[PDB]
Amino acid sequence: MKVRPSVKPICEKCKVIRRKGKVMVICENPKHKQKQG
Amino acid sequence: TPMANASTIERKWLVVDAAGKTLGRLSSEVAAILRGKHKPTYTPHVDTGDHVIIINAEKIELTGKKLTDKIYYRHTQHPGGLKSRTALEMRTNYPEKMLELAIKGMLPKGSLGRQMFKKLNVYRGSEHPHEAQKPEVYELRG
Amino acid sequence: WITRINAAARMNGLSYSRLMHGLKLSGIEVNRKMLADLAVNDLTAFNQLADAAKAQLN
Amino acid sequence: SRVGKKLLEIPSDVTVTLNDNNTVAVKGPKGELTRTFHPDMEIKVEDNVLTVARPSDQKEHRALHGTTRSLLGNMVEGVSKGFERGLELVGVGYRASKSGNKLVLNVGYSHPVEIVPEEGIEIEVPSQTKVVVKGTDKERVGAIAANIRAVRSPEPYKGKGIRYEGEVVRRKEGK
Amino acid sequence: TKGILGRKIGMTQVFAENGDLIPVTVIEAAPNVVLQKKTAENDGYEAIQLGFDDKREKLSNKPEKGHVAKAETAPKRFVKELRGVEMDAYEVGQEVKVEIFSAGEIVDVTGVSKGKGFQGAIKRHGQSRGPMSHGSRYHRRPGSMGPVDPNRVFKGKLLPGRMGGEQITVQNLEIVKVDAERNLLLIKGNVPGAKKSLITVKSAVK
RNA sequence: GGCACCUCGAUGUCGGCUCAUCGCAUCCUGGGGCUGUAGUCGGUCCCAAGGGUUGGGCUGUUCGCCCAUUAAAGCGGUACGCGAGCUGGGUUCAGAACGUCGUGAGACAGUUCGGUCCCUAUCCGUCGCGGGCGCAGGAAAUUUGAGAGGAGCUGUCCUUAG
RNA sequence: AUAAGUGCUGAAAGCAUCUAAGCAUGAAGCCCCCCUCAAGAUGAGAUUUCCCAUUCCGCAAGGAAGUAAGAUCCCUGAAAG
Known part of the structure; x- marks a missing residue:
């Protein structure tokens, strides 16, 4: 769970979605999930 | 020299239904009729306003x-x-607070302001405690 | 005077601004705010001016 | 490539009823389901046919159109044949047993736990190491499955607690 | 809930059949009488108000005499009311006595405090005082007012004032013996208030 | 630190004592995510300001270092909080000396010993306590509660169970 | 009732997706529950009980003069000061 203002898909099977106005990224690797801000 | 009226006033009793009117527009018009700015013989120091009652x-x-x-x-x-x-919050227990401070911020400030807020009463439901004032139903305009 | 005139116009279902606009294209209405206020205290005359302005407006 | 466009069916005595304001009540062999919808959707029931349409073509309209289509499908299918979600608890001492309507599940916690389904949602314990819930609607089925999972979600080293059917859990090597 | 009202006669110790020593509070309570049964549909809530001990006819006045004449007793000096009681349990004019309590029950106790008067901050709130030596002219003063920027002192800086006389509640007290013959109560602990004063005793809400 | 904008017809300057109060960019206690997280322990990050956040030795010292505890020994703001509340140890007078500089009178963010801290509270403000009046008759009691305050902290041991 | 978090169902965008529609769970945190004050709350609240609506004047606008219930002054005091 990273909290970075810059959100990148770390690997190709991460996918970027928007929840509650804040951009997340979800991947089945739990090491790759972060929110923006 | 125009007439500045004093103690030559009659107070109407008005009923407005608040179930479907947003409180911004409702407070804005209820402040005007509380001012008596609808009344033609308005003077700014004697409170030619009108008693109003909220419903719902x-x-x-x-x-x-x-x-x-x-x-x-x-x-x-x-x-x-x-x-x-x-x-x-306070929809649960006292909407009269939201209304009362809404028109409190609506109407002018001062001794006459307290005296002129004095005419307004606000209740839950659709039931007056009082019918002896013969309250008429009036609708909003804007 | 203006807010009294505004009340007089609104209770005939008219805005004050449209009222004076209609008066001005109705003619040179040299009648002014004080005596229009006295026309409010003689309101039937104020009605007799207001409908003339409204009917002239269109 | 449009799920909200396709049609739905009434196979075997699925009594779909349209109520006053876009409200639907269906009584099938499994039971009765009821649901209320905001009235901008047009739902007309025909013999073995039910309609769904949106007034305009824009974002929220498309979204709620597709969702209400899938949801009507979900209720009619659940009231037709029902739904079940299996669950296979794993480990070395973990014990799950029926205790009437209420379930008693034995986990390494110093106390046994308790779950009381009440919504017509029924549970079945076919084996010691495998439990299943039975319910009319998939939503409440998944809700009860979620609370059973939340008693002990598994660990990534050995794997314990509660597991869904074929649920792949991540493996971490703990030295 | 349940509770009575009495007069605090004193406090002592009593042994309790095991070797340990138990200080006790001694409260005599003549059997109280319920005078009015406050009900919801007119009072907005349900309660019973009850009187504790008598008065002479000299100090009795006509209004309270008429109020008491419904329950047909002597005039009552000490009247209080309780909330949360069983509404139908008490008929108006009945007594309550002392036996509704039993030894070993946890008890909420409430009484007025001992009045002390105008005491300084040292006694009043127990913050420490300055040095007594090394040049200190700050022996027993109540501390600095506050900062400078807010241009005023805040509310609630704790200053010298009167003590006492303000009712206080001690929770979870344990009744060790009840003497219904003499109409006495005996609670472990220490109970606030001066001697021969008000004291009300309740079943603990905890 | 830069600028010199209010104050030289005076706005008392370090530190300490008494008293707090606020923010959160959280030291503990609360809830979680990831872990190069087996478990006892941790690392980071997020939500969280309710409460708490120790006694000594040394130096005027804040600061530090050390001793011993604690769950923890937080960071900051409020005229580097608080002298019409206190302290006067140091800087910040007049005496005297040392080192150095100056031919000298003398001088040193160099040191050392000694060295007068005024005020009867007017109005706000604060903490208590009274009198009047009001509450469309006059009284004695019992209350409702809008709305204010306070408390709102934690360890150790046993068992589950080696 | 929530925060971080964990979700259930599901389209937009045939899949996926704690999400936009809905349904949940979730903190020494918020509101209550605990204790105290509190109707000057001028919005001056409520309950019970008692006194009764006398004498004069302008007759009446309203005053004044004895009172009832009930208080007070004064005195003995303290558990209060």
Whole structure:
């Protein structure tokens, strides 16, 4: 769970979605999930 | 020399239904009829206003996401203490608070302001305690 | 005077601004705010001016 | 490539009823389901046919059109044949047993736990190491499955607690 | 809930059949009488208000005499009311006595405090005092007012004033013996208030 | 630190004592995510300001270092909080000396010993306590509660179970 | 009732997706529950009980003069000061 203002898909099977106005990224690797801000 | 009326006034009793009128527009028009600015013989120091009664204070609706976004701050005079409650809060128990401070901020400030807020009463439901004043139903315009 | 005139116009279902606009294209209404206010205290005459302005407006 | 466009069916005595304001009540062999919808959707029931349409073509309209289509499908299918979600608890001492309507599940916690389904949602314990819930609607089925999972979601080293059917859990090597 | 009202006669110790020593509070309570049964549909809530001990006819006045004449007793000096009681349990004019309590029950106790008067901050709130030596002219003063920027002192800086006389509640007290013959109560602990004063005793809400 | 904008017809300057109060960019206690997280322990990050956040030795010292505890020994703001509340150890007078500089009178963010801290509270403000009046008759009691305050902290041991 | 978080169902965008529609769970945190004050709350609240609506004047606008219930002054005091 990273909290970075810059959100990148770390690997190709991460996918970027928007929840509650804040951009997340979800991947089945739990090491790759972060929110923006 | 125009007539500045004093103690030549009759007070009407008005009923307005608040179930489907947003409190911003409702407060804005209710402040005007509380001022008596609808009355033609208005003077700014004798309170030619009209008694109004709210009906269904419980059913106000709010535009946008104000239902949980509007905060009602209040500050007791003791140090380091602030109280707040949201807009969807006090719908549960006292909408009369939301209305009463809405028209309190609506109408002018001063001794006449207190005396002129004095005429307004606000209740839940659709039931007057009083019918002896022969209250007529009036609708909003804007 | 203006807010009294505004009340007089609104209770005939008219805005004050449209009222004076209609008066001005109705003619040179040299009648002014004080005596229009006295026309409010003689309101039937104020009605007799208001409908003339309204009917002239269109 | 449009799920909200396709049609739905009434196979075997699926009594779909349209109520006053876009409200639907269906009584099938499994039971009765009821649901209320905001009235901008047009739902008309024909013999073995039910309609769904949106007034305009824009974002929220498309979204709620597709969702209400899938949801009507979900209620009619659940009231037709029902739904079940299996669950296979794993480990070395973990014990799950029926205790009437209420379930008693024995986990390494110093106390046994308790779950009381009440919504017409029924549970079945076919084996010691495998449990299943039975319910009319998939939503409440998944809710009860979620609370059973939340008693002990598994660990990534050995794997314990509660597991869904074929649920792949991540493996971490603990030295 | 349940509770009575009495007069605090004193406090002592009593042994309790095991070797340990138990200080006790001694409260005599003549059997109280319920005078009015406050009900919801007119009073907004349900309660019973009851009187504790008598008065002479000299100090009795006509209004309270008429109020008491419904329950047909002597005039009552000490009247209080309780909330949360069983509404139908008490008929108006009945007594309550002391036996509704039994030894070993946890008890909420409430009484007025001992009045002390105008005491300084040292006694009043127990913050420490300055040095007694090394040049200190700050022997027993109540501390600095506050900062400078707010241009005023805040509310609630704790200053010298009167003590006492303000009712206080001690929770979870334990009744060790009841003497219904003499109409006496005997609670472990220490109970606030001066001698021969008000004291009310309740079943603990905890 | 830069600028010189209010104050030289005076706005008392370090530190300490008494008293707090606020913010959160959280030291503990609360809830979680990831872990190069087996478990006892941790690392980071997020939500969280309710409460708490120790006694000594040394130096005027804040600061530090050390001793011993604690769950923890937080960071900051409020005229580097608080002298019409206190302290006067140091800087910040007049005496005297040392080192150095100056031919000298003398001088040193160099040191050392000694060295007068005024005020009867007017109005706000604060903490208590009274009198009047009001509450469309006059009284004695019992209350409702808008709305204010306070408390709101934690360890150790046993068992589950080696 | 929530925060971070964990979700259930599901389209937009045939899949996926705690999400936009809905349904949940979730903190020494918020409101209550605990204790105290509190109707000057001028919005001056409520309950029970007692006194009764006398004498004069302008007759009446309203005053004044004895009172009832009930208080007070004064005195003995303290558990209060």
